Amino acid sequence: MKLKSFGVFGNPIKHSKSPLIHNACFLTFQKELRFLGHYHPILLPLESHIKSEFLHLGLSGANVTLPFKERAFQVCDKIKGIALECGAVNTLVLENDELVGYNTDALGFYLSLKYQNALILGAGGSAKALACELKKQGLQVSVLNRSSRGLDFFQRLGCDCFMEPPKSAFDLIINATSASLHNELPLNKEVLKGYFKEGKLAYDLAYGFLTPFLSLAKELKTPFQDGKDMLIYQAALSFEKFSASQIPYSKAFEVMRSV
Ligand SMILES: NC(=O)C1=CN([C@@H]2O[C@H](COP(=O)(O)OP(=O)(O)OC[C@H]3O[C@@H](n4cnc5c(N)ncnc54)[C@H](OP(=O)(O)O)[C@@H]3O)[C@@H](O)[C@H]2O)C=CC1
Numbered sequence: 001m002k003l004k005s006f007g008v009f010g011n012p013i014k015h016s017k018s019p020l021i022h023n024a025c026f027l028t029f030q031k032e033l034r035f036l037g038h039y040h041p042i043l044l045p046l047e048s049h050i051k052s053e054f055l056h057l058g059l060s061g062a063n064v065t066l067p068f069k070e071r072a073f074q075v076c077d078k079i080k081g082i083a084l085e086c087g088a089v090n091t092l093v094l095e096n097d098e099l100v101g102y103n104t105d106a107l108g109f110y111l112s113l114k115y116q117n118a119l120i121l122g123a124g125g126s127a128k129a130l131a132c133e134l135k136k137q138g139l140q141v142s143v144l145n146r147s148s149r150g151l152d153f154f155q156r157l158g159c160d161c162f163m164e165p166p167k168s169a170f171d172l173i174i175n176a177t178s179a180s181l182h183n184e185l186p187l188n189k190e191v192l193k194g195y196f197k198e199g200k201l202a203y204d205l206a207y208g209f210l211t212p213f214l215s216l217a218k219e220l221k222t223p224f225q226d227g228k229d230m231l232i233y234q235a236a237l238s239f240e241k242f243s244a245s246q247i248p249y250s251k252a253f254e255v256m257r258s259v
C-alpha cells in the first residue's frame, strides 16, 4: 500500500477539528481507498502561496480555511463544480498532476440547514459560498460588512450590500465573519440585539465553543445554531472529492459525526 498526504491550510489552525474527523475516515476506508491517508493541521504564513506549499508538501488533497479560501480560488490550475460560482475554494485535489479546486461549503451549509430572507455578516470565503447558495434557494440576501472590499461579487449575485446596518427584519442572521474565533462580536451589541429580537435563526459558522454572537442570541432566547453540522457535512463532501469520488459523502458523514 502507498501512503498519501492531506491537510488543512489556515491561520490560525489550532482550533480545527478537520484532522480528527478525516483521519477517522482514512482508517475506516483504507481497504476501499487502497492507500494509507493521513491528514495534518498546516499553519500557513499570511504571505505564503497555497499552491507552492501544497506542491512542496507533496499533498494529495487539502482543505482551505480562513483566511485563504478566496486566494485558493485564484491560485488553482482548474476550478470545478459550484466553486466556479463561489469565488472561493475550500477543497484542493491533485488531479492529472494539476491543482484542482472545489467548494463544499455551499452544499455543506445547505445540508446543515433544516426562511425568506437573510442577513450575512462577513464578506470573505465562507460568506461568498453562503450568499451563492442562499440566492439559489430563492432567498433575499443582504450582506453587511466592516469594509467595502470584495463586494462586486455580492452585487453581481443580486444581493443588497451595506456598511450601515439596515433597519429591517431578517429571518436568518448569519455570522460568517472570523470575529468569533478571535472571539469578539461581528457587530455592535445593541444592533445585533434588534436583529435577534426580530430574527428566526442566529447562525454562527464557528464551532466548538459558545461565541460572543451565539451567547447573545442565547441570552435573548432566539433560536441558534453553531457551525458543527456544516463542518461535518463539508468535511464529508471534501472526503468524497479526496477519494476521487469513490467514498460517497453520506458514508463519510456517519463516521465523522460519531468521532
Ligand atoms: N461551520 C463551520 O464549521 C464553518 C465555519 N466557517 C467559519 O467562518 C469564519 C470565516 O471564515 P472565512 O470566510 O474563510 O474567513 P475570511 O478570512 O475569508 O473572511 C472573514 C471575514 O470576517 C470579517 N471579520 C473579521 N473580523 C471581523 C470583525 N471583528 N467584525 C466584522 N467582521 C469581521 C472579515 O472582514 P475584513 O476583511 O474587514 O477583515 C472577513 O469578511 C471562520 O470562523 C470559519 O471557521 C467556515 C467554514 C466552515
Ligand SMILES: O=C(O)C1=C[C@@H](O)[C@@H](O)[C@H](O)C1
Pocket: 008, 015, 016, 017, 018, 019, 063, 064, 065, 066, 090, 091, 105, 231, 234
Ligand atoms: O475548521 C475547519 O477545519 C474548516 C472549516 C471550514 O472553513 C471549511 O470550509 C474548511 O474546509 C475546514
